[PDB]
Design a protein around this nucleic acid. Structure first.
Lengths: 48, 145, 359, 137, 84, 33, 70
RNA sequence: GGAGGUCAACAUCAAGAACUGUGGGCCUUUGCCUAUAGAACUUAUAACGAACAUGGUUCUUGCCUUUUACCAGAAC
């Protein structure tokens, strides 16, 4: 449910999308294709 | 109902019965009208009179070119005139576009959960295996290029 | 002058009979000027060939076109935008016709059917039954609530529009019919089959008024002229113009070395379009026969070479705008290029050829 | 010229009358009793002179009407004496015979002869060999 | 179909053999016809079945008609007497 | 691909609603009912 | 074999015109619509860290086929 | 003349809350305004029927070997 799943607060959205940015940048595209459409990030913090 | 039954009793059956195009006879009617459409455009290119025995031997390249399209074999005929090869290549690209679109539509109806026959799911698996291996061969070719 | 020199010495029994007279007259005859055309916008959005197009005969705001993905589409004329879509055939739509007396869209298709769409609710009202194979042609009668359809059946059916009864069947040809035009006075139905004839039908009697046998191959396209009461019939390179109510040969168009001519159209001020199977679209004067522009349709990005051919065309109601649909599954609009004058863009300079003996 | 506004009217009226006669006959021969609410509405002289009165008869509603009607197959004699003339004017196109590798309908035995790099590769393998020698050093 | 054509051929030969024997005996059994498989199946010696007349022209064909009719009647009589 | 003047536009959606008619009905008498 | 023909003609509509009809009433010819209308740091350890008109060669077919083949 | 009919024919029955006729004026007949005579039956928690069935076409579903025969909502 909506109470249950990750609650989209600006700091945590920016944090998770930033961590995926870094992990995507660590691997070349010619080796594998890591995309944001296939990923799932989940932040535990004081707002989640 | 009984009016039609009793008039069939006294008066036979109407000989003038035509057949509605249904799901049963659609993949046949597409063939009939495709080949009429091809043979008109090829009969107009000729400067001679074809006299009509040649026409049914001309359409064998249409059948062979479609078989070569499905199998991803390139279909070069060695002594073929140029605009006739252009006509056949045009109509085979037409038939293949309708073929690919129908494969996509029926796979979406298979995913969603719509009612579908057993033969239609076998036909759709056979279509999609062609489409996958054609994408695979073109990926190998573009890598080598 | 020179024809006096020929006539006093050679002495033809009829001065019109001799060929130097009929060639000297054409050189002295001097056709009219028309403006050159250009491409204006290109509209994508079908999933197969654009087989047929029709225009609103009243308001001139939208044009409908049927296609090879078995759907018809109503496009905005002025902006080019897609208003709506219509499905209801299972095989391709061969010809569309919008009525001018009632809000009816009669569509015809290759799956042997003829349908009547309401444009007030966008649904199918009336289905028609009786064609042994797939119909390729709809005209609508100008004053009598009829439909005339034809296909590979080798007959013309003249449907009543209320009771949907195949009232009158015209049995004349020896092949599929490519075009049927309706006409308000006694050559009331003018058809053209693939046995190189064009027939003028008496629909009350049931027989033919006159068979026109001048073409050598299948007649694929015809057109009625809006202000003239004459017809134009195209062939594999043979465009002629015919008078109705007599059946004369009024003029032959210099149309040589253009390939299979798929479509025709006639503007109000005597322009004749003739798009061909080789992607060449050529514009003629109507009263003369002079071809004053030829163009070639550049097809698309990843298209083929065979995939450029104008399969259908029409003109705007005001007439200054040409709508073609090519075999590269695209819709192209052509424009009169208002800037050019008689001195800037002259034409092709009118040199009729005594050789080919056709002029 | 275009045809005048009077001939359009005469032609429209005469042909409208004809189409309505055909539609009334087709709806009046039907077995549906409901069709006769959609229709929209004799003496003849048999010789020099005889003055007969053609009356119709009232038929039984249960016995079949049009007792001659039946479904038959007919050929028609196509008869004309209008000869009409066909008024015309005055190696590259040889298509080869078709041999297919899938179908052979008459089962013939056709002649057996008839039926049937980029630099990135090198640069990659060069760099891998250099990497091998570098790692060993 | 190959087999059925050969068998119908030999069946016709036997059917003519018995007639020739009875003709020698002096009793002339006429040849029975094949039966019709449907009600309007067409026999092809009764009539010229879809006879199209050649639409006469300007020239005159009375004596050539008489000459053909003479020749055909004489051929039929010769096949009757002598037998082709 | 056709130069500056000739515009191309890909079209896959219906701008008008599918219910909104093409030929609009004529209402003779204003009905307050 | 020899039952498999490419149709090379069509049934002429004139061929069934001299027939005499029958008069069975069909379910799709009942009266219907009788009316006509009318118009009017930690990030440093990594070695790498810093429409074509053919349907099969499109991106829609490739996203379809990359979805359905796993 | 009067009562009655499990008698017939022909009009009429769903619409600016809504009918027809007549006179006068304006436009050029249709239509608009104005003065007048009549309107049976049906209708406002809306319709002749304090009752209530089936058929066609196109959408959306349900049973799922295919078509009839079907499941049950919508529009015409």
């Amino acid at each position: 449910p909506k109470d249950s799943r990750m609650r989209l607060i600006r700091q945590d959205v920016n944090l998770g999308r930033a961590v995926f940015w870094e992990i995507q940048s660590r691997v070349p595209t010619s080796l594998t294709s890591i995309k944001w459409e296939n990923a799932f990030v989940s932040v535990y913090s004081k707002n989640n | 109902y009984i009016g039609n039954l009793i008039t069939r009793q006294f008066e036979g059956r109407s000989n003038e019965i035509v057949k509605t195009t249904t799901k049963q006879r659609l993949d046949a009617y597409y063939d009939l009208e495709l080949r009429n459409s091809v043979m008109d455009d090829i009969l107009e290119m000729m400067p001679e009179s074809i006299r009509q025995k040649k026409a049914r031997t001309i359409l064998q390249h249409l059948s062979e070119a479609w078989r070569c399209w499905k199998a991803n074999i390139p279909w070069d005929v060695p002594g073929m005139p140029a605009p006739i090869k252009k006509i056949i290549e045009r109509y085979i690209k037409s038939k293949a576009d309708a073929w690919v679109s129908a494969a996509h539509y029926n796979r979406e109806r298979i995913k969603r959960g719509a009612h579908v026959e057993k033969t239609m799911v076998k036909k759709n698996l056979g279509r999609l295996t062609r489409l996958w291996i054609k994408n695979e061969q073109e990926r190998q070719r573009q890598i080598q290029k | 002058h020179a024809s006096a020199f020929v006539n006093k010495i050679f002495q033809p029994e009829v001065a019109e009979e001799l060929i130097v007279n009929r060639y000297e007259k054409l050189l002295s005859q001097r056709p009219e000027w028309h403006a050159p055309w250009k491409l204006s916008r290109v509209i994508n959005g079908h999933l197969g060939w654009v087989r047929c197009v029709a225009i609103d005969p009243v308001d001139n705001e939208w044009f409908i076109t049927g296609s090879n993905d078995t759907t018809m589409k109503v496009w905005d004329l002025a902006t080019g935008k897609l208003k709506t879509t219509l499905a209801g055939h299972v095989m391709t739509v061969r010809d569309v016709a919008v009525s001018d007396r009632h809000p009816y869209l009669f569509s015809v298709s290759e799956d042997k059917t003829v349908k009547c769409w309401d444009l007030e609710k966008n649904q199918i009202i009336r289905d028609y039954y009786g064609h042994l194979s797939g119909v390729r042609t709809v005209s609508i009668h100008p004053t009598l609530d009829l439909i005339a359809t034809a296909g590979r059946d080798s007959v013309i059916k003249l449907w009543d529009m209320r009771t949907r009864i195949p009232v009158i069947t015209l049995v004349g040809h020896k092949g599929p019919i490519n075009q049927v035009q309706c006409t308000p006075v006694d050559p009331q139905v003018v058809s053209s089959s693939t046995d190189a004839t064009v027939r003028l039908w008496d629909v009350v009697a049931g027989k033919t008024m006159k068979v026109l046998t001048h073409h050598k191959r299948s007649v694929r396209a015809t057109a009625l002229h809006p202000k003239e009461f004459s017809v134009a019939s195209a062939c594999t390179d043979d465009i002629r113009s015919w008078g109705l109510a007599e059946g004369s040969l009024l003029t032959n168009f210099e149309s040589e070395k253009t390939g299979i001519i798929n479509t025709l159209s006639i503007n109000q001020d005597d322009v004749l379009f003739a798009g061909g199977d080789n992607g060449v679209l050529s514009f003629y004067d109507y009263k003369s026969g002079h071809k004053y522009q030829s163009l070639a349709t550049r097809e698309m990005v990843g298209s083929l070479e065979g995939e450029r051919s104008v399969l259908c065309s029409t003109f705007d109601k005001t007439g200054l705008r040409l709508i073609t649909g090519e075999a590269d599954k695209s819709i192209k609009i052509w424009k009169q290029d208002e800037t050019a004058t008689k001195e800037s863009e002259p034409g092709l300079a009118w040199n009729p050829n005594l050789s080919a003996k056709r002029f | 010229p275009l045809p005048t506004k009077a001939e359009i009217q005469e032609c429209t009226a005469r042909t409208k009358s004809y189409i309505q006669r055909l539609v009334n006959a087709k709806l009046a021969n039907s077995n549906n009793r409901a069709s006769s609410r959609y229709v929209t509405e004799a003496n003849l002289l048999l010789n020099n002179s005889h003055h007969i009165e053609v009356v119709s008869k009232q038929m039984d509603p249960l016995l079949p009407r049009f007792v001659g009607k039946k479904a038959r197959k007919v050929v028609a004699p196509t008869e004309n004496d209008e000869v009409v003339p066909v008024l015309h004017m005055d190696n590259e196109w040889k298509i080869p015979a078709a041999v297919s590798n899938w179908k052979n309908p008459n089962g013939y035995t056709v002649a057996l002869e008839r039926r049937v790099i980029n630099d990135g590769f090198m640069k990659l393998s060069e760099a891998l060999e250099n990497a091998d020698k570098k790692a060993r050093q | 179909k190959i087999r059925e054509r050969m068998l119908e051929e030999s069946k016709r030969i036997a059917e003519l053999q018995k007639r020739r024997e009875l003709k020698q005996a002096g009793i002339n059994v006429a040849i029975k016809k094949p039966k019709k498989k449907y009600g309007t199946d067409i026999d092809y010696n009764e009539d010229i079945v879809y006879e199209q007349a050649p639409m006469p022209g300007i020239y005159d064909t009375s004596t050539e008609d008489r000459q053909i009719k003479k020749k055909f009647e004489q051929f039929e009589r010769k096949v009757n007497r002598k037998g082709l | 691909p056709y130069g500056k003047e000739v515009e191309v536009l890909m079209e896959t959606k219906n701008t008008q609603s599918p219910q909104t008619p093409l030929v609009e009905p004529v209402t003779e008498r204003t009905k307050l009912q | 074999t020899t039952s498999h023909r490419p149709q090379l003609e069509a049934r002429s509509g004139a061929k069934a015109a001299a027939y005499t009809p029958t008069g069975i009433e069909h379910a799709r010819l009942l009266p219907g619509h009788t009316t006509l209308k009318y118009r009017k740091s930690w990030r440093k350890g990594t070695a790498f860290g810093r429409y074509i008109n053919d349907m099969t060669k499109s991106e829609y077919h490739q996203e379809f086929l990359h979805k359905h083949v796993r």
